[PDB]
C-alpha cells in the first residue's frame, strides 16, 4: 500500500505546515494582542543579542575546530538548562493547576515533549540543509547552493528558540516569559558569534557572514509568533506547548548540534562546554531570580 505512504506523507507535510501557519494565524487574533506584543519583543531582544555576538566575529574571523566545538557545547548546555528549568519545570506547575499535580501533570509535559521532537524531525526531513559531518540533508539537497543549505541549518536551529519565547509569554505571565527569554537572549550572544564564524567557514567573506548571522536572528521574533499561537487555543495548550518547545530544543541540541562536535574528535571539549553552559544557566536561574 504505497497509497498508505502517500497518505502519511500528505498528513506529515500538512501537519507541519498547519502547525506553523495556524500558529501564526491564531497568534494574530484579537484576544492575543497583548501576549503577542510581549512575545515578539522578547524575540526581538534575542535578535539584538544575536546581532551583538555576530559583530564580535569581525575581530576573530576564524577559530580552531577545538574552540568552535567548545563554544557550540556551551550554547547547547545553556539551552538544555533553559529547557529543563525555564520550560519543563514551569510547564509541570502549570499543568498541575489545570489537571492536578502528580504524574498526570508530567504526562501533559511529556506528551508535549514528544510532539516537539516530531515537529523538528519532520522539519528536518522536509527542509534541505547541511551539516559539516553528515553532509546535505532533505529534498533535492545535492543540487542546492551549499551556503544556503547551511543558512537553513541555522534557521531550523532558531525556530524552537523563538517558539519557546512565544510559548513562555502565552499567558501574559512575565514570571515565566522573562526567565526563559533572558536565558535565550544571553545564550544568543555567543551563538551569534558561532553562527557568523560557521557561515564564514562555509564560504562567505566575514562581512557578509556577519550580516547573514544578524538576519538569521529574525527567526526568533518570527518563531515567537508560532509559539504564541499554538499555546493559546485552550488552557492545556500552554503546558503542552511548554513541553513542545522544550522537546524541539532538546532535539536541536542532541540531533543537530552535539553530533557535529563528536566526529571531529572533540567529544571531550564539547562536553566541558555542555557542562559549563548548563551550570551557568542554573546559576542565572537563581541569580537573575
Ligand atoms: C518559516 C515559517 C514562515 C511562515 C510564513 C508566515 C505564513 C503566514 C502568512 C500570513 C499570515 C497572516 C495572518 C493574519 C491573521 C489574521 C487573524 C486576524 O484576527 C482575527 O481574525 C480576529 O481578531 C479574531 O479575534
Ligand atoms: C502537533 C505536532 C505536529 C507534528 C507533526 C508530526 C508529523 C510529521 C512528523 C515527521 C514527518 C517525517 C516524515 C519523513 C518524510 C520522509 C521523506 C520526505 O521528504 C520528501 O521527499 C517529500 O516528498 C518532500 O516534500
Ligand atoms: C537586519 C538584517 C540585515 C541583513 C540583511 C541580509 C544581508 C545579506 C548579506 C549578504 C548575502 C550575499 C551573499 C553573497 C553571495 C554568496 C555566494 C556564496 O556561494 C558561493 O560561494 C558561489 O557563489 C557559488 O555559487
Ligand atoms: C525569518 C528569518 C529570515 C532569515 C533570512 C536570512 C537571509 C540571508 C540572506 C542571504 C543568504 C546568502 C547565502 C545565499 C547564497 C547564494 C548567493 C547568490 O549567489 C549569486 O551570486 C547569484 O546567483 C548571482 O549574483
Ligand atoms: C524528563 C524529560 C525527559 C527528556 C528526555 C531528553 C533527554 C535525552 C536527550 C538526549 C539523549 C542523548 C543523545 C545522544 C545519544 C547518545 C548515544 C548515541 O550513540 C550514537 O549512536 C553515536 O555514535 C554517539 O553519540
Ligand atoms: Cl543551542
Ligand atoms: Cl574573510
Ligand atoms: Hg555558541
Residue numbers in the entry: 21 to 309
Relevant lines from the article:
The ZIP family consists of divalent metal transporters that are ubiquitously expressed in all kingdoms of life, mediating metal flux into the cytoplasm from the extracellular milieu or from the intracellular organelles/vesicles. The prototypical ZIP from Bordetella bronchiseptica (BbZIP) is an elevator transporter, but how the metal substrate moves along the transport pathway and how the transporter changes conformation to allow alternating access remain to be elucidated. According to the proposed mechanism, a TM bundle composed of TM1/4/5/6 (the transport domain), carrying the metal substrate(s), moves vertically relative to the static scaffold domain composed of TM2/3/7/8 to achieve alternating access. Three metal binding sites have been identified in BbZIP, including the M1 and M2 sites at the transport site and the M3 site at the end of the metal release tunnel.
To fix the relative orientation of the two domains for structural characterization, A95 and A214 were substituted by cysteine residues, allowing chemical cross-linking between them as there is no endogenous cysteine residue in BbZIP. The inability to completely convert the A95C/A214C variant to the cross-linked form, presumably due to the highly dynamic nature of the transporter, led us to use mercury (Hg) as a cross-linker for structural study. After a brief treatment with EDTA and desalting, the Hg2+-cross-linked sample was crystallized in lipidic cubic phase under a Cd-free condition, yielding a structure of BbZIP in a new IFC conformation at 1.95 Å, the highest resolution for BbZIP to date. As expected, a Hg2+ is chelated by C95 from TM2 and C214 from TM5, locking the relative orientation between the transport and scaffold domains. Although the cross-linked A95C/A214C variant was briefly treated with EDTA and crystallized in a Cd2+-free buffer, the two tethered metal binding sites (M1 and M2) are still occupied by Cd2+. The coordination spheres of the bound Cd2+ are not significantly affected by the rigid-body hinge motion of the transport domain, but a chloride ion (Cl−) was found to coordinate with Cd2+ at the M1 site. Rather, the anion may assist metal release from the high-affinity transport site by neutralizing the charges on the cation and excluding the otherwise coordinating sulfur atom of M99 from the coordination sphere. The Cd2+ bound at the M3 site, with an occupancy of 0.84, is coordinated with two histidine residues (H149 and H151) from the intracellular loop 2 (hereafter IL2), D144 from TM3, E276 from TM7, and an ordered water molecule, forming a distorted octahedral coordination sphere. Although the IL2 of BbZIP was found to be severely disordered in the previous crystal structures, Cd2+ binding to the M3 site stabilizes the IL2 which folds into two short anti-parallel β-strands and forms hydrogen bonds with the rest of the protein.
